[PDB]
Amino acid sequence: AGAGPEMVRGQVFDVGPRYTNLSYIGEGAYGMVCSAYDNVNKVRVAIKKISPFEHQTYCQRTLREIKILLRFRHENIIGINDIIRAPTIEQMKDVYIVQDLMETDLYKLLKTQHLSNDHICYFLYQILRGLKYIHSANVLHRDLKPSNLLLNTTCDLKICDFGLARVADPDHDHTGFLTEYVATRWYRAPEIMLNSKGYTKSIDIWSVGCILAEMLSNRPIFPGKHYLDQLNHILGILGSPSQEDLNCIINLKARNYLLSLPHKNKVPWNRLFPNADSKALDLLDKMLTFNPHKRIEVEQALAHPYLEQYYDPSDEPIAEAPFKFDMELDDLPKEKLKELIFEETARFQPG
Ligand SMILES: [N+]
Ligand SMILES: [N+]
């Protein structure tokens, strides 16, 4: 089998006899994505071709995503249905990841579709429901954004892409001013630019808040064009932080940067989003709170009046145990990484 060759790792798309049919969907990060007919379950599925074994980073992110997805089981988190690879490490060159077929993502939808308040509400509930599970496993996603939120034709929403995820580590979250960061710029919380490594749950809540804002207007709320511009966008709307919030920033370079800026007043949410439901804007305000300690937590968000039609804690499951396995994976040679990817994928083998 072959699929629309050329460039971007995806000439050969070799998914064994179980999966047939010839439908390019797009480019992932490490290869092409196709839909295919699952001759066993007799439904069409998605297949990602991963060809990560050339780079340490691709491999780390691939191992991370596989370990996490296989351990998680939740309606609002994409699962792995199957993994196709060679029977031996020596022959293992590509890895195919089979998942439920999700026809779009929130990014694509927001390019062309207005969302009713009912859709916004439903999407937000599902995002937070999945996030509650993730956080209950002591895991942080760290790159929540619309393109990492998949949707099917009935509007079921599933969180994807755990390539940047980490185990939460609040005691070791502090860093200096302007510390470089990997996750997508427009969805970074203010503290990332000031004093945070992104090792606490509050980082994800900020991103959800950004996504909420974007659902209300079909435009990213803070589209920074570079590292520090991101902060300037955030302050242009929230206004200058209070003395109390600022006294929380102990590191001098960060504090003094903020102190050097001209005073900016808060732009009221209802002026930015004049057609928004008032309860949505109250919740938005709580998620897009400058001070990460005052920011609302995932369970509190689910409990907010905006989501009252959906909130049901007994039907919002949490993980059976926290993750404590290594998610940094930074001191491992390429050989150990490949071996770990081989071992983590063994359960899908005839073997
Ligand atoms: N954090
Ligand atoms: N503040």
Author numbering: 7 to 357
What did the published study say regarding this structure?
A substantial body of information showed that ERK is overexpressed and hyperactivated in lung cancers. ERK is a signaling molecule commonly activated by risk factors of lung cancer including smoking, alcohol, and asbestos. ERK receives signals from many oncoproteins, including EGFR, Ras and MEK, and transmits the signals to its substrates that include c-Myc and ELK1. c-Myc is a transcription factor and well-known oncogene that promotes cancer cell proliferation. ERK directly binds and phosphorylates c-Myc at Ser62 resulting in c-Myc activation and enhanced protein stability.
Previously we determined the crystal structures of ERK2 complexed with caffeic acid or norathyriol. Because the catechol moiety is a part of these two molecules, we hypothesized that catechol could have binding affinity with ERK2. The hydroxyl groups of catechol were interacting with the main chain of D106, M108 and the side chain of Q105 located on the hinge loop. The adenosine ring of ATP in those structures is anchored to the hinge loop by Q105 and D106 residues. Similarly, catechol interacted with the same residues and occupied the nearby adenosine ring position inside the ATP-binding site. ERK2 can phosphorylate c-Myc at residue serine 62 (Ser62); and we found that catechol strongly inhibited Ser62 phosphorylation of c-Myc in vitro.
